[PDB]
Amino acid sequence: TVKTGIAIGLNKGKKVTSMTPAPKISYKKGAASNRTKFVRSLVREIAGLSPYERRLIDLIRNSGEKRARKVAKKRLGSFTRAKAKVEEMNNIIAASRRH
């Protein structure tokens, strides 16, 4: 992202010798540690599935991912959450009931 030097254009800015400093330790807030993975997997296999997750593993085997995204966006908020939830249910069906 070297600025071009002129006032407008593709890269808009003054030429400045850059530093790219040491990272803040957050920007890594969400990244799940080994303790978090073990705990969440354990509680997932204890707790079971909530009933809309059962109706989504119904629709993925039966009706398919398009209608699964259409229900999961309706059943949750945002569409980007309906992506990852149907991704989770794909992993649940695939990792378990195959073998």
């Binding site: 705990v39 509680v43 707790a47 079971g48």
Partner: protein, 203 residues
């Protein structure tokens, strides 16, 4: 460590075990009084990250609030005014029910001080919360510098001036461009920009 397990279990609500426990406990709590004492925190994790340290002085109360909108008074519906303001049924009461619970247990245990609170349960008629009150005159809390700020008398009824957890939400106090009507307080930021400031040497 085992509050992480309680934390993640409590995040899985409509799973079969927690809806069993939720049903037994909504029954049990509905059979007791509206405000009564919780002998022990039913959620040690969620009480524990709100400031509960299990020693002498911290008290949990458990409280039922009636659940829904606010049917306005002014009897037989007549507001006596413009049809702008002629509503009764659909008006919604700007403080949350979690705030009403904190305020009611603040009045009933007036010696104590509210700290935060947390949800426990709901049917259609009622929400049930637990309030995490502190007894400020107790010598275990007048010492022990991490919690003696409750002893100062400016925190008398934090619950009634919106100073608790759900108060500062309901006052809209956060940083941002989305809170310009209430960022330092709604009426202070009102009054500072309806005030005509005049100098001596009028600019």
């Amino acid at each position: 460590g085992a509050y992480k397990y309680l934390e993640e279990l409590q995040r899985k609500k409509q799973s079969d075990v927690l809806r069993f426990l939720q049903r037994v406990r909504v029954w049990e709590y509905r059979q007791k009084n509206v405000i009564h004492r919780a002998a022990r925190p039913t959620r040690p994790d969620k009480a524990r990250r709100l400031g509960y340290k299990a020693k002498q002085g911290f008290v949990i109360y458990r409280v039922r609030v009636r659940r829904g909108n606010r049917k306005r008074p002014v009897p037989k519906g007549a507001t006596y005014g413009k049809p702008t303001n002629q509503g009764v049924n659909e008006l919604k009461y700007q403080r949350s029910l979690r705030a009403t619970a904190e305020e009611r247990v603040g009045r009933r245990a007036a010696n104590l001080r509210v700290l935060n609170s947390y949800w426990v349960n709901q049917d259609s008629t009622y929400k049930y919360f637990e309030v995490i009150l502190v007894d400020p005159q107790h010598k275990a809390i007048r010492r022990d510098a991490r919690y003696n700020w409750i002893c100062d008398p400016v925190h008398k009824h934090r619950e009634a001036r919106g100073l608790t957890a759900t108060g500062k939400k309901s006052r809209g106090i956060n940083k941002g461009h989305k809170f310009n009507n209430t960022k330092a307080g709604r009426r202070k930021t009102w009054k500072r920009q309806n005030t005509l400031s005049l100098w001596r040497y009028r600019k």
